CSV table of C-alpha atoms and ligand atoms in Angstrom, one decimal:
chain,number,residue,atom,x,y,z
A,1,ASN,CA,0.0,0.0,0.0
A,2,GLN,CA,1.4,3.4,-1.0
A,3,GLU,CA,-1.3,6.0,-0.4
A,4,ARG,CA,-1.8,5.0,3.2
A,5,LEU,CA,1.9,4.4,3.8
A,6,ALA,CA,2.7,8.0,2.9
A,7,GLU,CA,0.1,9.2,5.4
A,8,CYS,CA,1.6,7.0,8.1
A,9,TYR,CA,5.0,8.4,7.5
A,10,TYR,CA,3.8,11.9,7.5
A,11,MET,CA,1.9,11.6,10.7
A,12,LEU,CA,4.8,9.8,12.3
A,13,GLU,CA,7.2,12.5,11.0
A,14,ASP,CA,9.5,9.9,9.6
A,15,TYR,CA,10.4,12.1,6.6
A,16,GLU,CA,13.3,9.7,5.8
A,17,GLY,CA,10.7,7.0,5.3
A,18,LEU,CA,8.7,9.4,3.0
A,19,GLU,CA,11.8,10.1,1.0
A,20,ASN,CA,12.5,6.4,0.6
A,21,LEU,CA,8.9,5.8,-0.5
A,22,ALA,CA,9.1,8.6,-3.0
A,23,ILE,CA,12.3,7.3,-4.5
A,24,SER,CA,11.0,3.7,-4.5
A,25,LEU,CA,7.9,4.7,-6.6
A,26,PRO,CA,7.9,4.4,-10.4
A,27,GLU,CA,8.7,7.4,-12.6
A,28,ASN,CA,5.1,8.6,-12.6
A,29,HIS,CA,2.4,7.9,-9.9
A,30,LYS,CA,-0.7,9.5,-8.4
A,31,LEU,CA,1.1,9.7,-5.0
A,32,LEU,CA,4.3,11.6,-5.9
A,33,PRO,CA,2.6,15.0,-6.1
A,34,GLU,CA,1.1,14.5,-2.7
A,35,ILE,CA,4.4,13.5,-1.2
A,36,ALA,CA,6.0,16.6,-2.7
A,37,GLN,CA,3.2,18.8,-1.2
A,38,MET,CA,3.9,17.1,2.2
A,39,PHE,CA,7.6,17.9,1.8
A,40,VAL,CA,6.8,21.5,0.9
A,41,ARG,CA,4.7,21.9,4.0
A,42,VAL,CA,7.3,20.5,6.3
A,43,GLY,CA,10.0,22.5,4.5
A,44,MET,CA,12.2,20.0,2.7
A,45,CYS,CA,12.9,21.9,-0.5
A,46,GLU,CA,15.4,19.4,-1.9
A,47,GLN,CA,13.1,16.3,-1.5
A,48,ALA,CA,10.1,18.3,-2.7
A,49,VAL,CA,11.9,19.4,-5.8
A,50,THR,CA,13.1,15.9,-6.6
A,51,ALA,CA,9.6,14.5,-6.1
A,52,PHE,CA,8.0,17.2,-8.3
A,53,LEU,CA,10.7,16.5,-11.0
A,54,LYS,CA,9.9,12.9,-10.8
A,55,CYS,CA,6.2,13.8,-11.3
A,56,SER,CA,7.4,15.8,-14.4
A,57,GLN,CA,6.0,19.1,-13.0
A,58,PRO,CA,9.0,21.5,-13.2
A,59,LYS,CA,6.7,24.5,-12.9
A,60,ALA,CA,5.8,23.5,-9.3
A,61,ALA,CA,9.4,22.4,-8.7
A,62,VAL,CA,10.4,26.1,-9.3
A,63,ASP,CA,7.4,27.6,-7.6
A,64,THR,CA,8.4,25.8,-4.4
A,65,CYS,CA,12.0,27.0,-4.7
A,66,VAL,CA,10.6,30.6,-5.1
A,67,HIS,CA,8.2,30.0,-2.2
A,68,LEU,CA,10.9,28.5,0.0
A,69,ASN,CA,13.4,31.3,-1.1
A,70,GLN,CA,15.8,28.8,-2.7
A,71,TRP,CA,16.5,31.1,-5.6
A,72,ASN,CA,19.7,29.3,-6.7
A,73,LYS,CA,17.7,26.1,-7.5
A,74,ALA,CA,14.9,28.2,-9.0
A,75,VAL,CA,17.2,30.0,-11.5
A,76,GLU,CA,19.0,26.6,-12.3
A,77,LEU,CA,15.7,24.9,-13.0
A,78,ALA,CA,14.6,27.8,-15.1
A,79,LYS,CA,17.7,27.6,-17.2
A,80,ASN,CA,17.2,23.8,-17.6
A,81,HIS,CA,13.5,23.5,-18.2
A,82,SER,CA,13.2,26.9,-20.0
A,83,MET,CA,10.9,29.0,-18.0
A,84,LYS,CA,13.0,32.2,-17.6
A,85,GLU,CA,10.3,33.9,-15.6
A,86,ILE,CA,12.2,34.0,-12.3
A,87,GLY,CA,14.5,37.0,-13.3
A,88,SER,CA,11.5,39.3,-12.7
A,89,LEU,CA,10.7,37.5,-9.4
A,90,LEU,CA,14.3,38.1,-8.1
A,91,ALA,CA,14.2,41.7,-9.4
A,92,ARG,CA,11.0,42.7,-7.5
A,93,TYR,CA,11.8,40.6,-4.4
A,94,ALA,CA,15.1,42.4,-4.1
A,95,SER,CA,13.4,45.8,-4.8
A,96,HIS,CA,10.9,45.1,-2.0
A,97,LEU,CA,13.9,44.1,0.3
A,98,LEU,CA,15.7,47.4,-0.6
A,99,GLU,CA,12.4,49.2,0.1
A,100,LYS,CA,12.7,47.7,3.6
A,101,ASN,CA,16.4,49.0,3.8
A,102,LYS,CA,17.6,45.4,4.0
A,103,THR,CA,20.4,45.8,1.4
A,104,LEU,CA,22.3,42.9,3.0
A,105,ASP,CA,19.4,40.6,2.3
A,106,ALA,CA,19.4,41.7,-1.3
A,107,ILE,CA,23.1,41.0,-1.5
A,108,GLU,CA,22.5,37.6,0.0
A,109,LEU,CA,19.9,36.6,-2.6
A,110,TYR,CA,21.9,38.0,-5.4
A,111,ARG,CA,24.7,35.8,-4.3
A,112,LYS,CA,22.4,32.8,-3.8
A,113,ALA,CA,20.9,33.3,-7.3
A,114,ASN,CA,24.4,33.9,-8.8
A,115,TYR,CA,23.4,37.4,-9.9
A,116,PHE,CA,26.8,38.4,-8.7
A,117,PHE,CA,26.9,41.7,-10.7
A,118,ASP,CA,24.0,43.1,-8.8
A,119,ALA,CA,25.3,42.2,-5.3
A,120,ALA,CA,28.7,43.5,-6.3
A,121,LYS,CA,27.1,46.8,-7.3
A,122,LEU,CA,25.2,47.0,-4.0
A,123,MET,CA,28.4,46.3,-2.0
A,124,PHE,CA,30.2,48.9,-4.1
A,125,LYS,CA,27.6,51.4,-3.2
A,126,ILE,CA,27.8,50.5,0.5
A,127,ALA,CA,31.6,50.7,0.5
A,128,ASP,CA,31.5,54.1,-1.2
A,129,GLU,CA,29.0,55.3,1.4
A,130,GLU,CA,31.2,54.1,4.2
A,131,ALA,CA,34.3,55.7,2.6
A,132,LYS,CA,32.4,59.0,2.4
A,133,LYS,CA,31.4,58.5,6.1
A,134,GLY,CA,35.1,58.2,7.1
A,135,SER,CA,34.5,55.1,9.2
A,136,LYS,CA,37.2,52.7,10.5
A,137,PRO,CA,39.6,51.8,7.7
A,138,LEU,CA,39.5,48.1,8.5
A,139,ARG,CA,35.7,48.0,7.9
A,140,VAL,CA,36.1,49.8,4.6
A,141,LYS,CA,38.9,47.4,3.6
A,142,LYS,CA,36.7,44.4,4.5
A,143,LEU,CA,33.7,45.8,2.5
A,144,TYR,CA,35.9,46.4,-0.6
A,145,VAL,CA,37.5,42.9,-0.3
A,146,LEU,CA,34.0,41.4,-0.3
A,147,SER,CA,33.0,43.6,-3.3
A,148,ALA,CA,36.1,42.5,-5.2
A,149,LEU,CA,35.4,38.9,-4.3
A,150,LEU,CA,31.9,39.3,-5.9
A,151,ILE,CA,33.5,40.9,-9.0
A,152,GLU,CA,35.9,37.9,-9.3
A,153,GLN,CA,33.0,35.4,-8.9
A,154,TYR,CA,31.1,37.2,-11.7
A,155,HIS,CA,34.2,37.1,-13.9
A,156,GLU,CA,34.7,33.4,-13.3
A,157,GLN,CA,31.0,33.1,-14.3
A,158,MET,CA,31.7,34.9,-17.5
A,159,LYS,CA,34.4,32.3,-18.6
A,160,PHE,CA,37.0,45.8,-14.4
A,161,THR,CA,38.7,43.8,-11.6
A,162,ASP,CA,41.5,46.5,-11.8
A,163,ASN,CA,38.8,48.8,-10.2
A,164,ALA,CA,37.6,46.5,-7.5
A,165,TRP,CA,41.0,45.2,-6.3
A,166,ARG,CA,42.3,48.8,-6.6
A,167,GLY,CA,39.5,50.0,-4.3
A,168,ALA,CA,40.5,47.3,-1.8
A,169,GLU,CA,44.2,48.3,-2.2
A,170,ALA,CA,43.5,51.9,-1.4
A,171,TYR,CA,42.4,51.3,2.1
A,172,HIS,CA,44.7,48.3,2.6
A,173,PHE,CA,47.7,50.6,1.9
A,174,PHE,CA,46.1,53.2,4.1
A,175,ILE,CA,46.1,50.6,7.0
A,176,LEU,CA,49.6,49.5,6.2
A,177,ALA,CA,50.9,53.0,6.1
A,178,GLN,CA,49.3,53.8,9.5
A,179,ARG,CA,50.7,50.5,11.0
A,180,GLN,CA,54.2,51.1,9.7
A,181,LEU,CA,54.1,54.7,11.0
A,182,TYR,CA,53.1,53.5,14.5
A,183,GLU,CA,55.8,50.7,14.5
A,184,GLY,CA,58.5,53.3,13.9
A,185,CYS,CA,59.6,52.3,10.4
A,186,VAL,CA,59.1,55.8,9.2
A,187,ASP,CA,60.8,55.4,5.8
A,188,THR,CA,58.5,52.5,4.8
A,189,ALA,CA,55.5,54.4,6.0
A,190,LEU,CA,56.5,57.5,3.9
A,191,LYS,CA,57.0,55.2,0.8
A,192,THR,CA,53.6,53.6,1.4
A,193,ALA,CA,51.9,57.0,1.7
A,194,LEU,CA,53.6,58.2,-1.5
A,195,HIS,CA,52.4,55.0,-3.2
A,196,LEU,CA,48.8,55.6,-1.9
A,197,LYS,CA,48.8,59.1,-3.3
A,198,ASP,CA,47.8,57.5,-6.6
A,199,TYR,CA,44.3,56.5,-5.2
A,200,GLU,CA,42.9,59.9,-4.5
A,201,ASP,CA,39.7,58.9,-6.3
A,202,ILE,CA,38.6,56.4,-3.5
A,203,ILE,CA,40.0,57.8,-0.2
A,204,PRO,CA,39.2,61.5,0.4
A,205,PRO,CA,42.1,63.7,-0.5
A,206,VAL,CA,42.3,65.5,2.8
A,207,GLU,CA,43.0,62.3,4.8
A,208,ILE,CA,45.5,61.1,2.2
A,209,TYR,CA,47.6,64.3,2.1
A,210,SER,CA,47.3,64.9,5.9
A,211,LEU,CA,48.8,61.4,6.4
A,212,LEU,CA,51.4,62.0,3.8
A,213,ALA,CA,52.4,65.3,5.4
A,214,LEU,CA,52.5,63.6,8.8
A,215,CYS,CA,54.8,60.9,7.5
A,216,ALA,CA,57.0,63.4,5.8
A,217,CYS,CA,57.4,65.4,9.0
A,218,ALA,CA,58.0,62.3,11.1
A,219,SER,CA,60.5,61.1,8.6
A,220,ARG,CA,62.4,64.3,7.7
A,221,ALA,CA,61.1,64.5,4.1
A,222,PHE,CA,60.3,68.2,4.2
A,223,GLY,CA,60.3,68.5,0.4
A,224,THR,CA,57.4,66.0,0.2
A,225,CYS,CA,56.0,67.8,3.3
A,226,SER,CA,55.8,71.1,1.3
A,227,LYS,CA,54.4,69.2,-1.7
A,228,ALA,CA,51.7,67.8,0.7
A,229,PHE,CA,50.7,71.1,2.2
A,230,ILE,CA,50.5,72.7,-1.2
A,231,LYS,CA,47.7,70.3,-2.2
A,232,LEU,CA,46.2,70.3,1.2
A,233,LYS,CA,45.7,74.1,1.1
A,234,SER,CA,44.7,74.0,-2.6
A,235,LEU,CA,41.9,71.5,-1.8
A,236,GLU,CA,38.5,73.0,-2.7
A,237,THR,CA,36.5,71.0,0.0
A,238,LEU,CA,38.0,72.9,3.0
A,239,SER,CA,36.6,75.7,5.1
A,240,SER,CA,38.2,79.1,5.2
A,241,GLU,CA,39.0,78.5,8.9
A,242,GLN,CA,40.5,75.2,8.0
A,243,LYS,CA,42.6,76.7,5.3
A,244,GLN,CA,43.9,79.3,7.8
A,245,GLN,CA,44.8,76.5,10.2
A,246,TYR,CA,46.7,74.7,7.5
A,247,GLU,CA,48.4,77.8,6.3
A,248,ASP,CA,49.5,78.7,9.9
A,249,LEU,CA,50.8,75.2,10.7
A,250,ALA,CA,52.7,75.1,7.3
A,251,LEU,CA,54.1,78.6,8.1
A,252,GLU,CA,55.4,77.4,11.5
A,253,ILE,CA,56.8,74.2,10.0
A,254,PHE,CA,58.7,75.9,7.2
A,255,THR,CA,59.9,78.7,9.4
A,256,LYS,CA,61.4,76.0,11.6
A,257,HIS,CA,63.0,74.0,8.7
A,258,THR,CA,63.8,74.4,5.0
A,259,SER,CA,61.1,73.4,2.5
A,260,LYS,CA,63.7,72.1,-0.1
A,261,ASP,CA,64.0,68.4,-0.1
A,262,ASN,CA,67.3,66.4,0.2
A,263,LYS,CA,55.3,51.4,-13.2
A,264,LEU,CA,56.7,48.3,-11.4
A,265,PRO,CA,54.3,46.1,-9.5
A,266,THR,CA,54.0,46.8,-5.8
A,267,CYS,CA,54.6,44.3,-3.0
A,268,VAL,CA,51.5,43.9,-0.7
A,269,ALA,CA,53.6,43.2,2.4
A,270,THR,CA,55.6,46.4,2.5
A,271,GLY,CA,54.6,48.6,-0.4
A,272,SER,CA,58.1,48.6,-1.9
A,273,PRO,CA,58.2,48.0,-5.7
A,274,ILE,CA,58.8,44.4,-6.7
A,275,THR,CA,62.1,44.8,-8.4
A,276,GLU,CA,62.8,41.0,-8.9
A,277,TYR,CA,61.2,39.4,-11.9
A,278,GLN,CA,60.4,36.2,-10.0
A,279,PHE,CA,58.1,36.9,-7.0
A,280,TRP,CA,55.4,35.2,-5.0
A,281,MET,CA,51.9,35.8,-6.5
A,282,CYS,CA,48.5,35.4,-4.8
A,283,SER,CA,46.0,32.9,-6.4
A,284,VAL,CA,43.1,35.3,-5.8
A,285,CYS,CA,43.9,39.0,-5.4
A,286,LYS,CA,46.5,38.9,-8.3
A,287,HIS,CA,49.0,41.1,-6.4
A,288,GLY,CA,52.5,39.9,-5.6
A,289,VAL,CA,54.5,39.7,-2.4
A,290,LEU,CA,58.3,39.8,-2.3
A,291,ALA,CA,60.2,36.5,-2.0
A,292,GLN,CA,61.8,37.7,1.3
A,293,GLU,CA,58.4,38.3,3.0
A,294,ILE,CA,56.1,35.5,1.6
A,295,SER,CA,57.0,33.0,4.3
A,296,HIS,CA,56.0,35.4,7.1
A,297,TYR,CA,52.2,35.3,6.2
A,298,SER,CA,50.0,32.2,6.3
A,299,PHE,CA,47.4,34.2,4.2
A,300,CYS,CA,47.7,36.8,1.6
A,301,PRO,CA,47.8,40.2,3.3
A,302,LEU,CA,45.6,42.0,0.7
A,303,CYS,CA,42.8,39.4,0.5
A,304,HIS,CA,43.5,36.9,3.3
A,305,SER,CA,43.2,34.0,0.9
A,306,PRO,CA,45.4,31.0,1.8
A,307,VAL,CA,49.0,31.4,0.7
A,308,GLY,CA,50.3,29.1,-2.0
B,1,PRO,CA,39.2,49.1,46.3
B,2,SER,CA,40.7,52.2,48.0
B,3,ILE,CA,39.7,55.6,46.7
B,4,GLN,CA,43.3,56.7,46.8
B,5,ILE,CA,44.1,53.6,44.8
B,6,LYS,CA,41.6,54.7,42.2
B,7,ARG,CA,43.0,58.2,42.1
B,8,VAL,CA,46.6,56.9,41.7
B,9,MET,CA,45.5,54.5,38.9
B,10,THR,CA,43.7,57.4,37.1
B,11,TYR,CA,46.8,59.6,37.4
B,12,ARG,CA,49.1,57.0,36.0
B,13,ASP,CA,46.6,56.3,33.1
B,14,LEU,CA,46.5,59.9,32.3
B,15,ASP,CA,50.3,60.2,32.5
B,16,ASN,CA,50.8,57.2,30.2
B,17,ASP,CA,49.3,58.4,27.0
B,18,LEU,CA,51.1,61.7,26.6
B,19,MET,CA,54.6,60.2,26.6
B,20,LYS,CA,53.2,57.1,24.8
B,21,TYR,CA,52.3,59.1,21.7
B,22,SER,CA,54.6,62.1,21.9
B,23,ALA,CA,56.9,60.3,19.5
B,24,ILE,CA,54.7,61.0,16.5
B,25,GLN,CA,52.3,63.6,18.0
B,26,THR,CA,54.9,66.5,17.8
B,27,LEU,CA,57.8,67.5,15.6
B,28,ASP,CA,61.1,68.1,17.5
B,29,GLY,CA,59.2,68.5,20.7
B,30,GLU,CA,58.0,72.2,20.1
B,31,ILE,CA,55.6,72.0,17.2
B,32,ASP,CA,52.3,70.3,17.9
B,33,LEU,CA,50.8,68.4,14.9
B,34,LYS,CA,47.3,67.9,16.4
B,35,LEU,CA,45.8,69.2,13.1
B,36,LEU,CA,47.4,66.4,11.0
B,37,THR,CA,47.2,63.6,13.6
B,38,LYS,CA,43.4,63.8,13.5
B,39,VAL,CA,43.3,61.5,10.4
B,40,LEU,CA,45.3,58.7,12.1
B,41,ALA,CA,43.5,55.8,13.8
B,42,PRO,CA,43.9,53.9,17.1
B,43,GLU,CA,46.7,51.3,17.3
B,44,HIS,CA,44.4,48.4,17.8
B,45,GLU,CA,42.3,49.5,14.9
B,46,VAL,CA,45.2,49.0,12.4
B,47,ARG,CA,46.2,45.6,13.8
B,48,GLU,CA,45.3,42.6,11.7
B,49,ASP,CA,46.0,38.9,12.5
B,50,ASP,CA,46.7,36.4,9.8
B,51,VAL,CA,43.3,34.7,9.7
B,52,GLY,CA,41.5,33.4,6.6
B,53,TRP,CA,38.7,35.6,5.4
B,54,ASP,CA,35.9,33.4,4.1
B,55,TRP,CA,33.1,35.2,2.4
B,56,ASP,CA,30.3,34.0,4.7
B,57,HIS,CA,31.8,34.8,8.1
B,58,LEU,CA,33.3,38.1,7.0
B,59,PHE,CA,30.0,39.1,5.5
B,60,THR,CA,28.1,38.1,8.7
B,61,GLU,CA,30.6,40.1,10.8
B,62,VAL,CA,30.4,43.2,8.7
B,63,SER,CA,26.6,42.9,8.4
B,64,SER,CA,26.3,42.7,12.2
B,65,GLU,CA,28.6,45.6,12.9
B,66,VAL,CA,26.9,47.8,10.2
B,67,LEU,CA,23.5,47.0,11.8
B,68,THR,CA,24.8,48.0,15.2
B,69,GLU,CA,26.3,51.2,13.8
B,70,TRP,CA,23.2,51.9,11.6
B,71,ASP,CA,20.1,53.4,13.2
C,401,ZN,ZN1,45.8,37.9,-2.4
C-alpha cells in the first residue's frame, strides 16, 4: 500500500521514510505530487523538488524554490527547463527588500541566485558610502574585499577587476601606512603613503595628504611635506578657517625648517616595488609579495586567501 | 578598592598616553601636529591577525557591525 503508507510516514514525522517511499515509486504515480506537497509543508525543499521533477512538474518544482526562497535552484531549473520567468521574481523581491532597507538581504539573494553583478554593485555602493562617512579603515577594507570577491566570482562566471581590487588596495595601503608609522619604520610608512597618493579617487584627498604630510614630518622629508601642504591648502573642499589653520601650521613648520628636499608592481607586504622578476603571487587577489616576505604570512595580506 | 588607589590609577593612566604618543604627535618637541594627527587611527584598529577571510563569516561580521552602527 502506497497511499496510506505515505500518510503514516507523514503523521509519524518519519520524513526519511517518506523520501525512501518517494524514491521507490515508479517514474510517474498518483502519489508523488502528494508526497511533494507534504515535503513543501514540512519545508524540505530538496526532496520536494526531486519529487516534483519525478512527477514531471517542473513548474511547481520552481514555484516551491521561489516559495521556500531557494533562488539558486529556481534559477538553475529555469535555465534547464526553459521557464526564464524568475528574473523578474528576483528583481522585484530584491526591490521590496531594498524598500525595507535590507540591502544585506538583497546581496544575500543575489549571491544565492548567482546574480553576482547586482550584489557587487550593491556592495560597491555600501563601501562608497562608508568611505564617504570616514569610518574605520579596516571596515572599509573588508567591504571592498567582499566587493572585489563578488566581482571575481562574476568574472569566473563569464568564462573591471582592476577597479575592485584597486579600491581594496587603497584602504589596505592606508592601513599598512598607519601600521608602519606606528611601528616606527618611518621610511616605509612614507614610501607607502607616496604609493597611496595615486588612489585619491577612492580615499578622500584630505586624509590622504594629511597622512602623507605627517609621515614626511616624522621622517624628515620636508620636500614632500611642502608638496603635501600645497595640495592640502589647494583642496577645494576645505573651510576658510581650516585653510587658515593649515596655512598657519605650514608657516610654523617651514619657518622651523627648510622646504627644499634632500610602473613596477607593488609588494603587498611592505609597499616597496617588486624589483625582482620572480616573485610570489596570490591565487586570488592577483597582487604579488616579495620572496623575502612571503613565508611570514599564512594568508595573503591583501585578500586573506590562503598562501600558495 | 581604596579611593586613593583609584586616584593613583587614574593619574598613572593619564600620564601614560602623553609620553606614549609624543613620539609622533609632535615634531622636534616644540611644534604640535594635532591638526594632522586627526586622520590617524587607534593602534588596535590597524592591527590585523593572519586569519583566513571566508566570504560567509566576513559578511556576517560586517553585516552585524553595520546594523549595530546603523540606526
Ligand atoms: Zn591575495
